[PDB]
Amino acid sequence: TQNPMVTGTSVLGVKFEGGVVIAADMLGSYGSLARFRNISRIMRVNNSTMLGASGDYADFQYLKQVLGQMVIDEELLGDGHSYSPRAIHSWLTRAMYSRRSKMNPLWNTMVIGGYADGESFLGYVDMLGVAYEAPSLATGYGAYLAQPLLREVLEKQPVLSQTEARDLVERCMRVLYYRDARSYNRFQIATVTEKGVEIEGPLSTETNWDIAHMI
């Protein structure tokens, strides 16, 4: 992709005790224009892993198609085996690097959350092929805005409950609504546990505008 036409924005993600939670908004921008306002930027991979993405949205529907077929064909083998979240994270890292080497990259940035075998997995995948793991991730301007709010909790408190993690995300989604020109007040929260993959509806933030009366 030489020039991304229709893009997304920041995608957040953080571990907690027994699962990963990922939230992202529902806007596909076009330059400074908000055309598509009801799209979903989170793909629920089979039962213990989960994917959100930024960048070019047409390339995301390509990877939504390719990863969809790699899950469909394995589950009809009856092997009793499935891909771990770090197996998909290792595959998708190779898919990025093998494609920038042909000078034709996929304009994306992807966050892979997953809860397999009693522990949480949270993985980052870059357009250039840079991958790492972290207890909290953020893309776009969330790496500048919401990412310091994630680390100042996880350094003072390493383990979090689910209600503590879900509260801490909605604060970070509120800040990105104030200080980002490509945000939108309609997002959805996805959460893996041992029970499965669950995606919530188009939630909204509550804004404060008390300083506007200060001349």
């Binding site: 198609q65 077929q69 469909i72 064909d73 009809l76 083998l77 009856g78």
Partner: protein, 240 residues
Amino acid sequence: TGYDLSASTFSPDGRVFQVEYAMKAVENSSTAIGIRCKDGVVFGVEKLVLSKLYEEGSNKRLFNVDRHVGMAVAGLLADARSLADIAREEASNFRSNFGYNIPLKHLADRVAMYVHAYTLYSAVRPFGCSFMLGSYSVNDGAQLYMIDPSGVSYGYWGCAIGKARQAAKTEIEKLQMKEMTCRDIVKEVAKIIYIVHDEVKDKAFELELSWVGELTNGRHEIVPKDIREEAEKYAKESLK
């Protein structure tokens, strides 16, 4: 002789023997039956226990092509799972190009043209497999097709392939598959394959059943253990 070595030559009365010789190899595989109910398709395969050393669940003659499409094979097992690979791959190109799940009148059309393509040349042989394809959709209902090694496909209300073919489909038309749901079918599928294969030829054998329909919510999977134990409970009442 000499008129029957290649598949590129007709006989002096106008038929190909290399296809007919490969049709003869199907009747040494055992028996695979499959009938469709009012709202789904139920497969059934009796599995010969060759020796004690094999493991229960080995070398399944009952595949799983797509999320909703099932396959039951009969023939030379190496060619069975080779045809299962291209049919599994053909459905992937449909969803990738056209967006949705492949229908059976198109899927069995693309596979039978791939089987027919090896009945023309001297460089390749015909396949030694016949198999059945069955599925269920919410917009099309239940479907059931069957493909010979020549490449001919038809629809069926119930079919049988293996050693005793006529001796199996004689009792299928005693049933009433137009009105039965796919629960009491499961007991009747097993019963007509206990009356076949006398215990002189084989000592012991294995039941293997399959199952699709909206009771399975469209997805193809194997029967649970307790349901096929009810059919194996309904085994030894054919002695009366």
